[PDB]
Design a protein around this ligand. Structure first.
Ligand SMILES: NC(=O)C1=CN([C@@H]2O[C@H](COP(=O)(O)OP(=O)(O)OC[C@H]3O[C@@H](n4cnc5c(N)ncnc54)[C@H](O)[C@@H]3O)[C@@H](O)[C@H]2O)C=CC1
Ligand SMILES: Nc1nc2c(ncn2[C@@H]2O[C@H](COP(=O)(O)OP(=O)(O)OP(O)(O)=S)[C@@H](O)[C@H]2O)c(=O)[nH]1
Ligand SMILES: [Mg+2]
Lengths: 177, 205
């Protein structure tokens, strides 16, 4: 078995831990949702090869930027995440997360992940966004971003509904090999 | 007087002093645990230390105990080690909203103190710690615990691939059924983030 490392990053609240949780437990967390997820080696098989992929959850908030580097050494692939719920978090792909990850994980493959895919066609969302003259990230904006920051590829998922979750980790395993 | 590792250089220096000559089986037991610890620890807590329920968990837990029970699997000196926990470590009636805007719920915090401060407990699962305060989860969880670990305590130090699926964590793993006393439960303010956090001082016994 090939052992690989995967570190997940993105703005606070953009759904990293819930992505990791749903990915293993196969159930969205409602009441006891941790800030950072416990160690978990996901066994994934892509194209005839079994990979044991260690997943590292990180804290997205600025307060933890000093501690995040401790998670970056010998990383095989980054899940860089923003919420489709929040263009603010996407703008932070190029502004905060790519510079960080490039400096610390130079040339490490990057998979751009749009979380909360379910919130794209949500009235409440669309409406609270419209208050700031914003709207939900469109797919081609994630793709555009993915190409602009040199990502391996681009994916959208919803932990809440488990839509695309499996796919994200299959892709990460592909960019880890 | 307990050794405290201020940084990477110190953790490493201390780290090399530890037994590491486990047998192959002993390394595999230890590394398997790091892969996912929910399976071990949640089983032990649910079933209170009895292993009769699950043949596989039985052999897997029995194996690790042996690795951790080796005469040479001991920490030479007295050391301070750390871990973070979520609020429900103090019971299902608590979640992480117990801290809001870096403010610890005084009311909830107090009933937690009344219930646990000064308490001697026995833990059924294994006990995962870091020798480096900044490592592991101590700064990313609502409750930080500092364990004062006495000389002679059985443990495994893990910080390389042969021993852990997560190297870089500076881990000291304590055997299961370790008794410890909660000496103090309190609130301290982070020097930097300026938020509140529940700090626990405990002594291995
Ligand atoms: N906690 C830390 O800061 C450190 C964690 N680790 C790593 O993490 C893994 C174990 O650490 P955890 O994530 O704490 O695993 P764990 O199985 O001890 O904890 C899982 C969850 O259950 C809670 N919990 C733990 N003990 C409990 C108890 N007696 N009663 C009620 N709830 C309890 C924890 O707060 C956490 O939310 C190991 O595989 C190790 O590799 C390693 C070094 C330090
Ligand atoms: N609608 C919807 N909500 C989600 C989804 N995933 C997570 N959330 C919600 O968003 C909030 C943040 O999710 P969470 O996974 O904790 O973010 P995080 O990246 O771990 O945040 P942090 O640890 O860096 S502060 C939670 O309230 C969670 O319920 C999703 O897929 N769809
Ligand atoms: Mg999180």
């Amino acid at each position: 078995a090939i052992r690989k490392k995967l570190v997940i990053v993105g703005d606070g609240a953009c759904g990293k831990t819930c992505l990791l949780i749903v990915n293993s437990k196969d159930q969205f967390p409602e009441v006891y949702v941790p800030t950072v997820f416990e160690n978990y080696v996901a066994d994934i098989e892509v194209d005839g090869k079994q990979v044991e992929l260690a997943l590292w959850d990180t804290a997205g908030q600025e307060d933890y930027d000093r501690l995040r580097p401790l998670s970056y050494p010998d990383t095989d692939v980054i899940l860089m995440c923003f919420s489709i719920d929040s263009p603010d978090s996407l703008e932070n792909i190029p502004e905060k997360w790519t510079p960080e990850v490039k400096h610390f994980c130079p040339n490490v493959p990057i998979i751009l992940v749009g979380n909360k895919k379910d919130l794209r066609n949500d009235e409440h969302t669309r409406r609270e966004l419209a208050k700031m003259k914003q709207e939900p990230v469109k797919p081609e904006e994630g793709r555009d971003m993915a190409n602009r920051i040199g990502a391996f590829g681009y994916m959208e998922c919803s932990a809440k509904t488990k839509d695309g979750v499996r796919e994200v980790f299959e892709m990460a395993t592909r960019a880890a090999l | 007087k307990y050794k405290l590792c201020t940084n990477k250089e110190e953790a490493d220096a201390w780290g090399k002093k530890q037994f590491n000559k486990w047998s192959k089986e002993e390394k595999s037991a230890i590394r398997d645990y790091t892969k996912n610890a929910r399976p071990y620890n949640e089983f032990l807590r649910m079933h209170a230390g009895k292993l009769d329920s699950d043949p596989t968990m039985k052999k897997k837990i029995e194996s690790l105990d042996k690795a951790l029970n080796r005469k040479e699997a001991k920490v030479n000196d007295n050391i301070k080690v750390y871990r973070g926990d979520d609020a429900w470590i103090f019971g299902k009636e608590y979640d992480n909203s117990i801290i809001k805007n870096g403010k610890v719920d005084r009311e909830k915090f107090k009933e937690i103190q009344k219930k646990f401060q000064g308490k001697t407990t026995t833990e059924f699962g294994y006990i995962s710690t870091s020798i480096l305060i900044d490592a592991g989860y101590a700064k990313t969880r609502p409750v930080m615990t500092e364990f004062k670990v006495g000389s002679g305590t059985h443990g495994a130090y893990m910080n390389s691939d042969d021993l852990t699926a997560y190297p870089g964590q500076y881990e000291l793993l304590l055997p299961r059924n370790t008794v410890y006393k909660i000496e103090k439960i309190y609130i301290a303010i982070d020097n930097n983030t300026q938020k509140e956090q529940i700090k626990v001082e405990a002594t291995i016994k």
